[PDB]
Symmetry: D2
Subunit: 280 residues, 4 copies
């Protein structure tokens, strides 16, 4: 160790400074995913499908994930429309063996995984915690939205380390930074705050072989928010600086930014796409 | 509800504005805890014992909690030295049924609970997650440092709501806001970030009847974190603006601040006591 | 330098670790300001007078500051009521020579300054910036609320360094963390965010001889908010988890905490007293 | 206003909800800037030139700004290489009258301004503030790094509001969120924190007609910060999770993200590009 500058963050970086990637001098080339394999969980759903389709547009092979809604037709659509390889996989991400077995099969079928989006999740819809005496629903949120995200990260991390490269994006939420109102949802906020800081912690630990970042969406027009009445949505609009909910298409730019070589010095960051909601 | 100003945060506040409490004319009397009962989990250990003793000095009856290290002589020390009432209770906070019984008994023994400090926890010590394939380590952290905190909160909140008053303090960590180095501990950091934001979420939901805040200590010279290696501690000191670890006696003022009527407008706050560590 | 652990933050700490203060084992004694001199700017106003009176209650000599409203009668009241030394000083804090001359005279009249509260400030009341084409009002906010705070800090810092001890508290605002609505006040928010990060920066630089912290109040019932109509206050209440504005008396506990030996490991922190406003 | 949902943030949004834009079907086309005019201050220097060239690659007409280092050959390089239109402008951004004239001329020369990057700035280099008694250093930082940014924003916002569209990007710094060490620079950190929160405040006020975001770079290998000392840089590397400084080419993707229609729901956001530095 004499004769080396040793990192205070992660000695597995080796003697410092590490060396910067060789990048195209053209900014547009940086956003390409040509020759790359992406795996997007929760990709039978709103945000996941938008991101998955966009990764296919950028040139990537895409592994689609679903649980209770088969998305084989979505994978088939990606191959016929963009000519990339795509397949759909059924997995309950609360089951850690099933996560391990799904990702291991994806690595076999696609050869590798370059980009991973840990996106599947469920909401809390039962109002204030004080009145839910039964711990099933807390356990459901923690299992899927926190433990399941860690199962995906821990297994994909081993592939990134073997190959020496990778980009992990975790879908967090503004709920990891603020407390949603008027719908009270403490267990979901707790899990998403944990997701956001897990991303920062893994960014440190994986730095020799991968980048880890989060997207924190605001209110996005998907079916996840269909439990909400008109008067509750109206209050969301009143508190959003842009004055509306976002579209799933307004998120894909950030997911592509983080997945691609546009962001090779970006790690441990939280990219907020929320119409300004976290500012007031 | 015509004519009432209804909260966007919590309609159980009633028609706004809510009304402020009467408070002592003298600032020093605001910190008094006589007439109050406090319950401090993990008060076998370093921080918990310091807080428990400080609360007795302020005049509170204090319920001591332990798991593997019986603390009855601690409770009887509080009895003897300060003339308050005190009893020690054995509880595994990862078991929700035992948490409920312990809280229920304390309410029976002391009459009520005014102040609750959710402080018990364990560290992660196994280095980088990517080399730990038993999820048992991950599960143990989450079940004690996150689930167990939620079990305590869910039960004590019902007492606060019955009585219409209460202060809940959660011991989080600087690890919920930053990523510790060089000792990598992503599971612990994730759990503590969850605790910090659970605090903020419960502050909104419980606002009609209680305040909820957290203390985020830095490196504190308890027995646990003093068997780590010279070279590790030295790096912590180099990155701490005050240049040293903290004493447990440097935490008790923040815990008394949040427990007492000195902080009646303070809720959802995170008090960092870390020698400046989160600043660089 | 061989044979020393050198700080990465501030080599003027000397060889590490620095040594912890010897504190009373009784938590109540930690909050005393007996034998200490405090200087509170803006102390003809609401928050400043409450803090000043409270510091006198805790045992401190108090230097009162005013600009357009003489507060000699307030200083006289402190001496007749609590028996401490107190005098009032007229200073326009936008004037850096006047700041220097006031603090230098206070050090002569009182012997030293142990605690300094940089609290004087003015609000922006002119609505959205886009319609204020004239830069007077931006310049007014920056001069008083930012430059004036630095003039006080820079001059008091020299006294703390000479004596090797001190505590600086800056009154910031939730406006340094969030964007107030519906009253649009970008220049004030900008200055208060600067105040909050100046506190963290000075905490690093002054660490060998002083602590620096901020209080960030929410909406407090003083005359600073009298420009606001009932329908605007009502929206503030709707967005505040506690459902009301705070009282000045609800801030003094935090100002005493930071001023006293209750907080000797607390530096660079921002203590938010806002009824939970920053949580949603 | 009966029957309308009125914003709590900004009533000039009109009756809510506001309406979303039509966007390209293909994610890659979202990043296009053809048909757009961009104005990039400080584009003599490292970061500004990189951004200006990246915007021309994306198809934008680009206005170059300089002060002491004429950049007409830079603008003519953009002319020659990309076929866009480009001109360089000499302006001292600490002088508000010259900022207004420069912005006015650019509007006349190019027809409009769609994208504005407020990027010009200077560092603090004089070590700890407490030893610097000329406020000239403090004043120079504030006047260029804060006041000058506000002058650019105030003027360009009127163009955006006239046209009903626009994207403003402010170059802040990791220094607005953390305190750099070992080089102490409180004045600069304070100014950059002000820029970050000015961004957030202007995002709310301008929301009916523009987005406002900031990029917060870490240590970037520009000429300015490469003449610092070996031992200083080595400490930066040791505390950076990626183990190195960033290249200016690692920033341009974030600037293009925020400038383009890839980020139409992104406002008030701070994109950290710092190799993970703010995480430990
Ligand atoms: N939409 C919004 O407003 C925002 C959403 N988010 C987060 O975005 C993520 C996706 O949300 P969104 O697209 O909006 O909602 P959707 O319900 O449309 O997507 C949910 C996806 O999660 C999958 N999934 C759900 N449960 C499981 C489970 N046990 N095991 C494996 N997969 C499961 C679903 O699969 P299947 O249907 O096949 O069962 C589905 O593909 C979530 O993490 C959400 O918390 C955060 C900010 C705002
Ligand atoms: N020391 C430090 O530097 C810092 C500590 N913290 C947090 O402060 C809290 C206490 O830490 P500290 O005092 O330093 O450490 P200690 O090990 O001294 O205290 C641990 C306490 O937790 C109790 N406890 C442990 N496991 C369980 C369990 N299953 N069920 C119920 N109770 C349990 C222990 O009880 P018993 O011994 O009887 O088994 C003990 O009272 C923790 O939450 C820690 O994460 C946060 C920032 C820094
Ligand atoms: N009240 C609130 O809701 C909150 C206030 N704050 C901040 O609290 C601080 C005090 O505010 P508050 O007590 O509520 O309002 P007040 O108007 O009651 O107090 C203002 C004080 O500032 C002094 N002052 C004003 N201008 C100058 C000037 N050029 N030079 C020297 N002194 C000056 C005034 O002196 P004089 O009257 O003698 O001229 C007065 O003592 C301020 O920094 C405010 O920004 C932040 C969060 C919320
Ligand atoms: N380099 C880094 O690591 C980081 C830089 N930043 C910020 O990025 C911005 C540019 O930095 P960088 O490119 O690295 O530094 P450079 O010194 O290379 O760029 C400085 C630019 O500012 C312009 N400028 C300087 N002073 C004035 C002035 N009074 N009036 C008008 N224009 C002026 C200069 O113009 P001219 O040369 O023609 O006089 C130059 O174009 C700055 O805001 C910096 O604070 C933030 C994080 C890290």
């Amino acid at each position: 160790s004499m004769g080396e500058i040793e990192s205070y963050c992660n000695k597995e970086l080796g003697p410092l400074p590490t060396k910067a990637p060789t990048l195209s001098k053209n900014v547009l080339d940086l956003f390409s995913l040509k020759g790359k394999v992406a795996s997007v969980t929760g990709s039978s759903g709103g945000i996941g499908w938008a991101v998955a389709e966009a990764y296919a547009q950028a040139g990537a092979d895409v592994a689609i994930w679903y649980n209770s809604h088969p998305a084989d037709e979505k994978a088939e659509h990606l191959q016929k429309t963009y000519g990339v390889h795509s397949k759909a996989y059924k997995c309950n991400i609360s089951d850690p063996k099933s996560v391990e077995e799904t990702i291991s099969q994806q690595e076999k079928d696609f050869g590798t995984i370059d980009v991973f989006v840990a996106n599947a999740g469920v909401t809390w819809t039962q109002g204030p915690e004080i009145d839910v005496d039964n711990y099933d629903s807390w356990n459901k949120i923690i299992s899927v939205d926190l433990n399941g995200v860690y199962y995906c990260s821990h297994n994909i991390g081993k592939i990134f380390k073997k190959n020496g490269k990778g980009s992990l994006i975790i879908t967090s939420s503004i709920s990891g930074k603020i407390v949603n109102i008027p719908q009270l949802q403490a267990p979901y906020n707790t899990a998403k705050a944990a997701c956001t800081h897990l991303a920062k912690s893994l960014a440190i630990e994986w730095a020799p072989f991968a980048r880890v970042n989060t997207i924190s969406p605001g209110y996005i027009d998907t079916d996840i928010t269909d439990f909400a009445s008109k008067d509750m949505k109206a209050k969301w609009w009143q508190l959003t600086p842009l004055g509306r909910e976002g579209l799933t298409q307004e998120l894909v730019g950030g997911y592509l930014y983080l997945a691609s070589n546009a962001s090779t010095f970006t790690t441990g960051s939280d990219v907020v796409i929320d119409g300004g909601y976290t500012c007031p």
